Design an enzyme around this catalytic site. Structure first.
Site, PDB file in Angstrom:
ATOM      1  N   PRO A  17      52.683  58.943  45.531  1.00 42.32           N
ATOM      2  CA  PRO A  17      53.126  60.264  46.262  1.00 42.32           C
ATOM      3  C   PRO A  17      54.157  61.089  45.816  1.00 42.32           C
ATOM      4  CG  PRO A  17      52.014  58.795  47.913  1.00 42.32           C
ATOM      5  CD  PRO A  17      52.400  57.845  46.740  1.00 42.32           C
ATOM      6  N   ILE A  18      54.298  62.157  45.238  1.00 41.37           N
ATOM      7  CA  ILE A  18      55.476  62.727  44.641  1.00 41.37           C
ATOM      8  C   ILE A  18      56.670  63.000  45.851  1.00 41.37           C
ATOM      9  CG2 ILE A  18      54.022  63.509  42.901  1.00 41.37           C
ATOM     10  CD1 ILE A  18      54.917  66.252  43.831  1.00 41.37           C
ATOM     11  N   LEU A  19      55.998  63.118  46.779  1.00 41.63           N
ATOM     12  CA  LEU A  19      57.157  63.566  47.982  1.00 41.63           C
ATOM     13  C   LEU A  19      56.840  62.261  48.817  1.00 41.63           C
ATOM     14  CD1 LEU A  19      58.671  66.062  49.354  1.00 41.63           C
ATOM     15  CD2 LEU A  19      56.654  66.437  50.521  1.00 41.63           C
ATOM     16  N   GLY A  20      57.979  62.003  49.333  1.00 40.02           N
ATOM     17  CA  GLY A  20      57.995  60.678  50.362  1.00 40.02           C
ATOM     18  C   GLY A  20      59.285  61.040  51.255  1.00 40.02           C
ATOM     19  N   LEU A  21      59.338  60.191  52.297  1.00 40.62           N
ATOM     20  CA  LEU A  21      60.477  60.368  53.392  1.00 40.62           C
ATOM     21  C   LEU A  21      61.548  59.133  53.089  1.00 40.62           C
ATOM     22  CD1 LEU A  21      61.536  61.441  55.975  1.00 40.62           C
ATOM     23  CD2 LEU A  21      60.509  59.296  57.063  1.00 40.62           C
ATOM     24  N   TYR A  23      69.594  49.489  54.205  1.00 36.23           N
ATOM     25  CA  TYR A  23      69.554  50.485  55.173  1.00 36.23           C
ATOM     26  C   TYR A  23      69.541  50.037  56.556  1.00 36.23           C
ATOM     27  CZ  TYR A  23      68.242  53.301  51.089  1.00 36.23           C
ATOM     28  OH  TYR A  23      68.028  53.836  49.914  1.00 36.23           O
ATOM     29  N   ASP A  76      60.370  55.916  51.520  1.00 32.90           N
ATOM     30  CA  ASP A  76      61.441  55.089  50.703  1.00 32.90           C
ATOM     31  C   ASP A  76      62.235  54.281  51.541  1.00 32.90           C
ATOM     32  OD1 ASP A  76      62.871  54.176  48.326  1.00 32.90           O
ATOM     33  OD2 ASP A  76      64.625  55.638  49.152  1.00 32.90           O
ATOM     34  N   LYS A 131      63.787  47.899  48.388  1.00 34.07           N
ATOM     35  CA  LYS A 131      64.570  47.830  47.261  1.00 34.07           C
ATOM     36  C   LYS A 131      65.221  46.313  47.388  1.00 34.07           C
ATOM     37  CE  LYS A 131      65.164  52.541  47.076  1.00 34.07           C
ATOM     38  NZ  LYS A 131      65.479  52.766  48.682  1.00 34.07           N
ATOM     39  N   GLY A 152      48.497  51.185  37.166  1.00 30.58           N
ATOM     40  CA  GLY A 152      47.148  51.512  37.863  1.00 30.58           C
ATOM     41  C   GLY A 152      47.331  52.507  39.071  1.00 30.58           C
ATOM     42  N   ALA A 153      48.183  52.133  39.805  1.00 34.50           N
ATOM     43  CA  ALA A 153      48.318  52.892  41.239  1.00 34.50           C
ATOM     44  C   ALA A 153      48.797  54.289  41.188  1.00 34.50           C
ATOM     45  CB  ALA A 153      49.379  51.993  42.200  1.00 34.50           C
ATOM     46  N   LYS A 154      48.488  55.177  41.911  1.00 33.15           N
ATOM     47  CA  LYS A 154      49.039  56.412  41.944  1.00 33.15           C
ATOM     48  C   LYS A 154      50.291  56.464  43.085  1.00 33.15           C
ATOM     49  CE  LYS A 154      45.193  59.529  40.199  1.00 33.15           C
ATOM     50  NZ  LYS A 154      44.078  58.510  40.493  1.00 33.15           N
ATOM     51  N   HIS A 196      67.777  47.596  43.208  1.00 36.61           N
ATOM     52  CA  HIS A 196      68.508  48.626  43.790  1.00 36.61           C
ATOM     53  C   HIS A 196      69.713  49.239  43.056  1.00 36.61           C
ATOM     54  CE1 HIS A 196      69.441  50.510  48.048  1.00 36.61           C
ATOM     55  NE2 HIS A 196      69.835  51.375  47.145  1.00 36.61           N
TER      56      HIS A 196
HETATM   57  N1  LIG Z   1      68.302  54.234  45.134  1.00 37.38           N
HETATM   58  C1  LIG Z   1      69.377  54.768  45.682  1.00 37.38           C
HETATM   59  O1  LIG Z   1      70.487  54.304  45.257  1.00 37.38           O
HETATM   60  C2  LIG Z   1      69.610  55.612  46.546  1.00 37.38           C
HETATM   61  C3  LIG Z   1      70.634  56.414  46.837  1.00 37.38           C
HETATM   62  C4  LIG Z   1      70.734  57.426  47.794  1.00 37.38           C
HETATM   63  C5  LIG Z   1      69.586  57.903  48.367  1.00 37.38           C
HETATM   64  N2  LIG Z   1      68.512  57.248  48.181  1.00 37.38           N
HETATM   65  C6  LIG Z   1      67.291  57.606  48.723  1.00 37.38           C
HETATM   66  O2  LIG Z   1      66.983  59.045  48.799  1.00 37.38           O
HETATM   67  C7  LIG Z   1      66.804  59.545  50.197  1.00 37.38           C
HETATM   68  C8  LIG Z   1      67.155  60.959  50.347  1.00 37.38           C
HETATM   69  O3  LIG Z   1      68.531  60.959  49.858  1.00 37.38           O
HETATM   70  P1  LIG Z   1      69.856  61.171  50.955  1.00 37.38           P
HETATM   71  O4  LIG Z   1      69.725  60.462  51.956  1.00 37.38           O
HETATM   72  O5  LIG Z   1      71.080  60.567  49.974  1.00 37.38           O
HETATM   73  O6  LIG Z   1      70.263  62.766  51.209  1.00 37.38           O
HETATM   74  P2  LIG Z   1      69.313  64.103  51.224  1.00 37.38           P
HETATM   75  O7  LIG Z   1      67.821  63.656  51.540  1.00 37.38           O
HETATM   76  O8  LIG Z   1      70.001  64.747  49.962  1.00 37.38           O
HETATM   77  O9  LIG Z   1      69.754  64.937  52.301  1.00 37.38           O
HETATM   78  C9  LIG Z   1      69.724  64.194  53.789  1.00 37.38           C
HETATM   79  C10 LIG Z   1      70.597  64.980  54.598  1.00 37.38           C
HETATM   80  O10 LIG Z   1      70.421  66.368  54.728  1.00 37.38           O
HETATM   81  C11 LIG Z   1      69.815  66.650  56.160  1.00 37.38           C
HETATM   82  N3  LIG Z   1      68.574  67.424  55.959  1.00 37.38           N
HETATM   83  C12 LIG Z   1      67.355  66.729  55.786  1.00 37.38           C
HETATM   84  N4  LIG Z   1      66.063  67.633  55.905  1.00 37.38           N
HETATM   85  C13 LIG Z   1      67.033  68.747  56.047  1.00 37.38           C
HETATM   86  C14 LIG Z   1      66.312  70.194  55.980  1.00 37.38           C
HETATM   87  N5  LIG Z   1      65.158  70.458  56.018  1.00 37.38           N
HETATM   88  N6  LIG Z   1      67.199  71.350  56.184  1.00 37.38           N
HETATM   89  C15 LIG Z   1      68.705  70.942  56.387  1.00 37.38           C
HETATM   90  N7  LIG Z   1      69.031  69.827  56.230  1.00 37.38           N
HETATM   91  C16 LIG Z   1      68.375  68.639  55.854  1.00 37.38           C
HETATM   92  C17 LIG Z   1      69.490  65.412  56.930  1.00 37.38           C
HETATM   93  O11 LIG Z   1      70.115  65.504  58.208  1.00 37.38           O
HETATM   94  P3  LIG Z   1      69.167  64.934  59.541  1.00 37.38           P
HETATM   95  O12 LIG Z   1      68.613  63.538  58.812  1.00 37.38           O
HETATM   96  O13 LIG Z   1      70.341  64.763  60.363  1.00 37.38           O
HETATM   97  O14 LIG Z   1      68.251  65.888  59.880  1.00 37.38           O
HETATM   98  C18 LIG Z   1      70.442  64.406  56.205  1.00 37.38           C
HETATM   99  O15 LIG Z   1      71.796  64.641  56.746  1.00 37.38           O
HETATM  100  C19 LIG Z   1      67.603  58.677  50.990  1.00 37.38           C
HETATM  101  O16 LIG Z   1      67.509  58.552  52.400  1.00 37.38           O
HETATM  102  C20 LIG Z   1      67.412  57.272  50.260  1.00 37.38           C
HETATM  103  O17 LIG Z   1      66.049  56.819  50.939  1.00 37.38           O
HETATM  104  C21 LIG Z   1      68.511  56.222  47.402  1.00 37.38           C
HETATM  105  C1  LIG Z   2      79.225  49.947  46.472  1.00 34.07           C
HETATM  106  O1  LIG Z   2      78.985  49.621  47.827  1.00 34.07           O
HETATM  107  C2  LIG Z   2      79.052  50.213  49.077  1.00 34.07           C
HETATM  108  C3  LIG Z   2      80.398  50.293  49.623  1.00 34.07           C
HETATM  109 BR1  LIG Z   2      81.668  49.379  48.819  1.00 34.07          BR
HETATM  110  C4  LIG Z   2      80.557  51.021  50.681  1.00 34.07           C
HETATM  111 BR2  LIG Z   2      82.466  50.731  51.391  1.00 34.07          BR
HETATM  112  C5  LIG Z   2      79.550  51.715  51.230  1.00 34.07           C
HETATM  113 BR3  LIG Z   2      79.694  52.473  52.967  1.00 34.07          BR
HETATM  114  C6  LIG Z   2      78.162  51.689  50.741  1.00 34.07           C
HETATM  115 BR4  LIG Z   2      77.020  52.437  51.873  1.00 34.07          BR
HETATM  116  C7  LIG Z   2      78.036  50.963  49.524  1.00 34.07           C
HETATM  117  C8  LIG Z   2      76.855  50.907  48.908  1.00 34.07           C
HETATM  118  N1  LIG Z   2      76.177  52.240  48.490  1.00 34.07           N
HETATM  119  C9  LIG Z   2      76.926  53.091  47.669  1.00 34.07           C
HETATM  120  O2  LIG Z   2      77.935  52.792  47.327  1.00 34.07           O
HETATM  121  C10 LIG Z   2      76.283  54.323  47.752  1.00 34.07           C
HETATM  122  C11 LIG Z   2      75.065  54.827  48.130  1.00 34.07           C
HETATM  123  N2  LIG Z   2      74.390  53.635  48.860  1.00 34.07           N
HETATM  124  C12 LIG Z   2      73.063  53.959  49.548  1.00 34.07           C
HETATM  125  C13 LIG Z   2      71.976  53.342  48.180  1.00 34.07           C
HETATM  126  O3  LIG Z   2      72.410  52.764  47.368  1.00 34.07           O
HETATM  127  O4  LIG Z   2      70.733  53.758  48.445  1.00 34.07           O
HETATM  128  C14 LIG Z   2      75.124  52.634  49.182  1.00 34.07           C
HETATM  129  O5  LIG Z   2      74.430  51.773  49.911  1.00 34.07           O
END
Ligand SMILES: NC(=O)c1ccc[n+]([C@@H]2O[C@H](COP(=O)([O-])OP(=O)(O)OC[C@H]3O[C@@H](n4cnc5c(N)ncnc54)[C@H](OP(=O)(O)O)[C@@H]3O)[C@@H](O)[C@H]2O)c1
Ligand SMILES: COc1c(Br)c(Br)c(Br)c(Br)c1Cn1c(=O)ccn(CC(=O)O)c1=O
Length: 316
Positions: A14-18, A49, A44, A78, A10-12, A111
């Site tokens: 945002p396609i862009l998030g921090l 974290y 997010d 998560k 039911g909810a919408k 997660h």
């Molecule tokens: N569910 C999961 O397992 C999972 C796993 C990974 C990530 N995520 C989510 O996805 C989010 C984004 O992914 P990510 O953190 O892996 O990395 P990302 O968004 O691909 O890249 C972030 C990096 O790029 C830099 N950056 C950001 N904006 C920029 C810009 N406009 N120009 C140049 N560089 C820029 C940032 O630097 P500064 O911050 O220093 O500016 C940071 O070092 C995560 O933070 C997390 O919330 C989820």
């Molecule tokens: C597999 O568990 C570990 C281990 Br082991 C180490 Br060491 C680190 Br550092 C992290 Br960040 C994690 C967890 N982990 C990842 O491996 C990869 C990405 N992320 C970020 C995320 O899940 O959103 C992790 O937390």
């Protein structure tokens, strides 16, 4: 596409998030205050974290100045892997609610599909370096998630890093109460996810793409690794469009009906990142991008390769 995609609940959304993985507690508040200032309505978050308190500060700050209303905010946390044992899910959820200082989440994800031994240690490892699993199963964990919906703590439930067989297993779970609303996965030009993206949308599940910029700040980044942001082929499409290589990377998944969650704590970049509701990429480039795919994963959870629920053995 439309700024707020609609979920199967039911909810919408945002396609862009921090994105806030790797945003140190000391910087993350000011980043969430800023990102809300520019217009982001989607954050997010994860317990793992280790900054939810600080995040939560910025969110309360903005509400208590009425810069934004609660129901305008789409907030995602998560459930970390050490919390899969069904009896611990609720508590983990309340804890993150308490951190963020919220009464409810708009979206709680499992997660990773992989359960760890419960503790304080987020990644518990045996002497050989692989994590210590729990023998929890997904469906039981998922059922505890569902109870969270019924109890009013979360408004939706999703999954993250699930292969299709893993989503399928929940979908076909006897007695299923809610289908997952979202699969949050790694998606970007060197990992286009065409197969799993297809599977997920078809089942009516919205796909959030994580690490859109490739996550150069990922701690285990080898210097010799490819860099999306500094790829000449990708730099061009940006110059051609009079936008930054990052802004390309961010609009790319948005033009695929994905949600996208770039991470920044740099206020300039944060806002550079939100300046994408105002142009379009050509199908020429879209297909070119999709051709860069190297099946390269930034997050491969390699310490979990011998976990029975390790998701990345499957082709998709
Ligand atoms: N569910 C999961 O397992 C999972 C796993 C990974 C990530 N995520 C989510 O996805 C989010 C984004 O992914 P990510 O953190 O892996 O990395 P990302 O968004 O691909 O890249 C972030 C990096 O790029 C830099 N950056 C950001 N904006 C920029 C810009 N406009 N120009 C140049 N560089 C820029 C940032 O630097 P500064 O911050 O220093 O500016 C940071 O070092 C995560 O933070 C997390 O919330 C989820
Ligand atoms: C597999 O568990 C570990 C281990 Br082991 C180490 Br060491 C680190 Br550092 C992290 Br960040 C994690 C967890 N982990 C990842 O491996 C990869 C990405 N992320 C970020 C995320 O899940 O959103 C992790 O937390």
């Amino acid at each position: 596409m439309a700024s707020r995609i609609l979920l199967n609940n039911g909810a919408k959304m945002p396609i862009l998030g921090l994105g806030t993985w790797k945003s140190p507690p000391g910087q993350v508040t000011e980043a969430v205050k800023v990102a809300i200032d520019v217009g982001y309505r989607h954050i997010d978050c994860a317990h793992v974290y280790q900054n939810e308190n600080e995040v939560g500060v910025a969110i309360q700050e903005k509400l208590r100045e009425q810069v934004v209303k609660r129901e305008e905010l789409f907030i995602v946390s998560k459930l970390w892997c050490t919390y899969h044992e069904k009896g611990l899910v609720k508590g983990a959820c309340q804890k993150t609610l308490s951190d963020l200082k919220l009464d409810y989440l708009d979206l709680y994800l499992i997660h990773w599909p992989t359960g760890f031994k419960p503790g304080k240690e987020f990644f518990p490892l045996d002497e050989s370096g692989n994590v210590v699993p729990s023998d929890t199963n997904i469906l039981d964990t998922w059922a505890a998630m569902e109870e969270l919906v019924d109890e009013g703590l979360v408004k939706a439930i999703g999954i993250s890093n699930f292969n299709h067989l893993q989503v399928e297993m929940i979908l076909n779970k006897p007695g299923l109460k809610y289908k997952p609303a979202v699969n949050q996965i790694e998606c970007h030009p060197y990992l286009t996810q065409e197969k799993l993206i297809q599977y997920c949308q078809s089942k009516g599940i919205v796909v959030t793409a994580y690490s859109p910029l490739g996550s150069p700040d990922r701690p285990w980044a080898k210097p010799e690794d490819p860099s999306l942001l500094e790829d000449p082929r990708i730099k061009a499409i940006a110059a051609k469009h009079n936008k930054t290589t990052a802004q390309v990377l961010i609009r790319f998944p948005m033009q695929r009906n994905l949600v996208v969650i770039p991470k920044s704590v740099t206020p300039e970049r944060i806002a550079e990142n939100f300046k994408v509701f105002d142009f379009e990429l050509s199908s020429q480039d879209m297909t070119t991008l999709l051709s860069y795919n190297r099946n390269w994963r930034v997050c491969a959870l390699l310490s979990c390769t011998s976990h029975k629920d390790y998701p990345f053995h499957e082709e998709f």
